Amino acid sequence: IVGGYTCAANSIPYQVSLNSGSHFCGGSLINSQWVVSAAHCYKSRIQVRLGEHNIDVLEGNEQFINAAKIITHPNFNGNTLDNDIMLIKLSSPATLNSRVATVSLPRSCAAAGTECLISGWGNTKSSGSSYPSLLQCLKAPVLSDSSCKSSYPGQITGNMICVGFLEGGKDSCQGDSGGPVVCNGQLQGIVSWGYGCAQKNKPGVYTKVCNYVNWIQQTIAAN
Ligand SMILES: [Ca+2]
């Protein structure tokens, strides 16, 4: 997260870290056994870390649970990042409490202008790199489809939304992928891609979660 703030401890209780030796992606807890993330975050071995604030220090509220099932969207396109969504089934259910909690799926798509919260442990610099210990937070609005397509001509499918600021300076970045965009208590976006980070007229591009509610519910019910 570039240009954000350090979140208060466990104030984003659905935020998880995907770890394969080190933190490499975010994700969101949507029921006690299932995490949603980005398909391009796929690895064949994944430990999900819940209840994290400082990812470099054991603080006492963590739960480390291995991924048992790892299911990418069947129409994921690795060239365009279309359908950039993935479901992880935990090998045992997380214990839900005030610091480890689920986030609701969207009841409808978010309108342009809707204010959201983006979070993660990704890069905090738009030039160079700095990876933080503490979870970072950013308030940002959903952008119109026409604005998003103008920012990225010929790249924004009907399964993508832009969230952020055309003036740049505030954005998600590498290491945030798979993490949440939550608006009015609903997971509307998954950190997916962009051109650089916090660049002018290049807001972050996010998987449009409201298109996948049916796929998510059916996959969970069937597995
Ligand atoms: Ca920790």
Side-chain angles (χ1 to χ4, degrees):
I1 305 287
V2 177
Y5 55 103
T6 296
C7 315
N10 308 113
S11 62
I12 317 306
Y14 49 84
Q15 170 90 53
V16 309
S17 168
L18 308 185
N19 186 293
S20 54
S22 65
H23 167 87
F24 72 89
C25 274
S28 304
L29 189 70
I30 55 165
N31 72 36
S32 68
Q33 288 189 288
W34 286 91
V35 164
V36 68
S37 180
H40 84 259
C41 290
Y42 179 86
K43 295 183 180 192
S44 67
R45 325 175 174 244
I46 298 177
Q47 186 183 70
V48 179
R49 299 185 167 195
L50 306 100
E52 287 278 23
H53 191 36
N54 185 325
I55 49 169
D56 295 313
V57 177
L58 286 175
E59 288 186 283
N61 298 118
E62 295 95 342
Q63 303 173 45
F64 293 181
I65 306 165
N66 288 324
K69 297 181 193 307
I70 309 172
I71 308 177
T72 52
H73 195 280
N75 295 330
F76 173 60
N77 181 321
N79 290 323
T80 62
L81 291 189
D82 198 21
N83 307 114
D84 193 8
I85 185 169
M86 177 170 77
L87 283 164
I88 287 162
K89 200 189 176 166
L90 303 174
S91 56
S92 66
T95 296
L96 300 180
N97 53 45
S98 61
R99 305 188 172 71
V100 176
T102 61
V103 64
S104 303
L105 294 177
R107 303 186 256 288
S108 63
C109 296
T114 303
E115 292 290 346
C116 308
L117 180 69
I118 316 174
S119 47
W121 291 275
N123 197 354
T124 63
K125 293 164 78 178
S126 55
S127 173
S129 68
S130 173
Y131 286 86
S133 291
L134 284 301
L135 183 67
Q136 299 293 296
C137 273
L138 173 67
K139 294 181 203 183
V142 173
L143 302 174
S144 72
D145 189 56
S146 63
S147 161
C148 181
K149 279 148 158 67
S150 313
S151 293
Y152 300 97
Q155 301 191 87
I156 306 299
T157 67
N159 303 311
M160 302 171 185
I161 59 173
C162 284
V163 186
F165 304 87
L166 295 188
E167 59 265 45
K170 296 193 283 191
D171 203 358
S172 58
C173 188
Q174 279 67 46
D176 291 321
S177 274
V181 180
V182 171
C183 327
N184 296 326
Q186 293 156 86
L187 183 70
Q188 295 282 8
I190 297 159
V191 183
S192 187
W193 62 277
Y195 183 86
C197 301
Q199 298 305 292
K200 180 174 155 173
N201 292 121
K202 301 291 174 175
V205 185
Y206 298 84
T207 307
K208 192 186 198 170
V209 175
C210 65
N211 287 357
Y212 298 99
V213 172
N214 276 312
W215 177 76
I216 292 161
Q217 293 177 339
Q218 281 168 34
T219 300
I220 289 176
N223 295 280

